[PDB]
Ligand binder design. Structure first.
Ligand SMILES: CNCc1cccc(Cl)c1
Lengths: 412, 412
């Protein structure tokens, strides 16, 4: 058999706020976090906007000296991670520290640090490269620094699965607990790819919306006028915990993680298959994992990136998996408001799926003014929808055809 | 309930060879793969040598057209993965493709690619960034491109845990199989960090040997004259397979993977604790996981990076875990010959641990002229040692205090 895994703490940096309740307030109000990118010359770039984290104070978390050693993506992961542990009320002791682990991931990692150290390398030569360049830039340093700050001695690792990172991190963290490797995990993802190489890299593949005149309308999942995704920054962290461990200390339980699906499309390097076969296999894997029939699913937080091929594949996938129940469930893209946090997308959207269960409300897909051909599901267009939600899915799909599905159930 | 996991295929690029057999002959003969770097001008760098893959022909594996789009770390990852899958004799069919996944990791991923596109960005502008920059550079695309080429629709992900990546990738892929999420996984790692940012970054931290005038003697694990690790490039991939699946199809079985340990040190961002506490916890987790008497351990493939602090910590850990049996086992560092393949270190070294079991020989630590204070175990100085080996252990440690142990034994 298998142990049960519940969510006892959550933490977040998003384009909508510097914590969960501020972010969620934005989500349910249909507020956009998208705006022209500041303190950065994007004149030569075809995209000049995205979801930036606004007003973040790293010194709430770290000394200025420690923050100077770490890429923004690491600072954001630590912020969410420290919020999530504090939210959980968990007391780390000598008796439990070996049973508490970390899996915080990134799609892209320390691009901003790499770019500034490149500046120094090209202009002055290697002797201007920071000594903290390597440990301050690598993706496992959110897990590493968190474990060192808090004395966590359980499983210590990082996933990097492109836009699927957050979903995979949480899912495999839940496996570690379910199969007795740990009693607590801090899991999720962080991303800060709003550098030249980030905007430039996605810009060169024409993956980005170029709607510079109306940044708040750029992200329009399933809308016939969508033209690619919106690049966003931030982090999500969840405290995952074995149920008996949570009950014994009187933890506040947000929801239970009942199901985790992984699948590979094995299709294309960047494009999803049009019939959504991969997303369909992954969701079916996750529902089997939960012992749930597709009819029991009430809410899906879609990947919903606002790319032509991505949005339509997810419609096909849901119709395929859910048949006669496909219109009954509500499916929304919170990327309509946050944009695409890449590796952290799965983390913040897991938290929104948990909060949809707590508050019995499907978040809107804003900007869905003209649903595209065959986009006829309940996509919660424009405004939040109060409804019955016992079971919520969060889907992620990524470059390399890598799929992730988490199934959350109400806990009472 | 937990299934057993065996190795049925292996593949490799190392500084000693373009496959496993050729690499392994170099190991047993005590050959160095370390040489002045030729692919760039390192006159302004304090370290000008490393373990390059020599004469790699990507067109043994991939079309020139696809190869041009991929960082060397991806090319190296795919070459090892293709070798391993071919070496397994496994046939991918519609009957099994959903039960076959991949977890190939990297410490740093496409740093050469990111630097070249950085140069283009700074000298030309954003319009000269390759459209292939992202899918061609990010860590998860070894797993991605392998799944696309072979049609693997099982779990598809990637770990990044710095110098522990290869051991974690293998260990967690074994967990996937053990607990029924897959019947087969291709798992290991690849690294190509020998660019300006790589040698410069490790250079800035003064982590690297500066023995430019004698590169073959640079890597000298536990030698009193060691002065840092030697940076090396390459790939290791293994085909992990549920025992009964392997038995059913008549697979040749190299060895059984009986044990996996992870622990975080929670000590320091980059320095290991002098007493080896994190390595000790990790090895004890792994031996308990394998249901072993510690006295069953015959051979350890050490992390053995040739740093002052890392090398003695490992002696401390092995003495603490094995007590008087620490004087009966053999421990060596093949990094004496290969140098430190970083995220691929744990992958090549897992394969060397398996071949130590097949061939009943402890690979040497070359350059161990003057063992340092306290380094008085059988470290197999200078020359391969034929000997009884039923149980072999492979250790990795990385930045972030991240530890990994794999336990293999002979299978009949
Ligand atoms: C099905 N996978 C279960 C698993 C994954 C990772 C670690 C452990 Cl213990 C178990």
């Amino acid at each position: 058999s298998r142990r049960r895994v519940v969510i006892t703490g959550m933490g977040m940096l998003s384009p909508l706020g510097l914590d969960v309740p501020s972010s969620w307030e934005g989500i349910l109000a249909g507020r956009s976090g998208i705006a022209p990118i500041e303190h950065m010359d994007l004149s030569a770039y075809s995209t000049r906007f995205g979801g930036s984290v606004k007003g973040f104070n790293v010194e709430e978390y770290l000394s200025a000296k420690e923050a100077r050693k770490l890429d923004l993506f690491i600072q954001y992961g630590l912020a969410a991670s420290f919020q999530a542990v504090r939210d959980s009320g968990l007391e780390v002791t000598d008796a439990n520290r070996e049973r508490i682990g970390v899996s915080m991931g990134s799609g892209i990692g320390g691009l901003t640090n790499i770019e500034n150290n490149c500046r120094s390398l090209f202009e002055q030569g290697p002797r201007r490269i920071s000594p903290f360049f390597v440990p301050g830039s690598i993706i496992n340093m959110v897990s590493g620094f968190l474990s060192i700050h808090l004395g966590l001695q359980g499983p210590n690792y990082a996933l990097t699965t492109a836009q699927t990172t957050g979903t995979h991190s949480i899912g495999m963290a839940a496996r570690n607990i379910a199969y007795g490797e740990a009693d607590v995990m801090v899991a999720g993802g962080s991303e800060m790819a709003a550098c030249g190489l980030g905007l430039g890299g996605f810009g060169a593949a024409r993956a980005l919306s170029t709607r510079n005149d109306e940044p708040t309308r750029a992200s329009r999942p399933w809308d016939r006028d969508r033209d690619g995704f919106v690049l966003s920054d931030g982090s999500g962290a969840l405290v995952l915990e074995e149920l008996e461990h949570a009950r014994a200390r009187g933890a506040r339980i947000y929801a239970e993680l009942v199901g985790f699906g992984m699948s590979g499309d094995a299709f294309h390097m960047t494009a999803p298959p049009e019939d959504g076969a991969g997303a369909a296999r992954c969701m079916k894997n996750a529902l089997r994992d939960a012992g749930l029939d597709p009819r029991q699913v009430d809410y899906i937080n879609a990947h919903g990136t606002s790319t032509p091929a991505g949005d339509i594949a997810e419609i096909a996938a849901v119709k395929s998996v859910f048949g006669e129940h496909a219109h009954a469930l509500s499916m929304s893209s919170t990327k309509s408001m946050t944009g695409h946090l890449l590796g952290a997308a799965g983390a913040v959207e897991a938290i929104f799926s948990v909060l949809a269960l707590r508050d019995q409300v499907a978040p809107p897909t804003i900007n869905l003014d003209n649903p595209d051909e065959g986009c006829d599901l309940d996509l919660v267009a424009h405004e939040a929808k109060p409804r019955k939600i016992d079971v919520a899915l969060s889907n992620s799909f990524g470059f390399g055809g890598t799929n992730g599905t988490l199934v959350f159930r109400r806990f009472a």
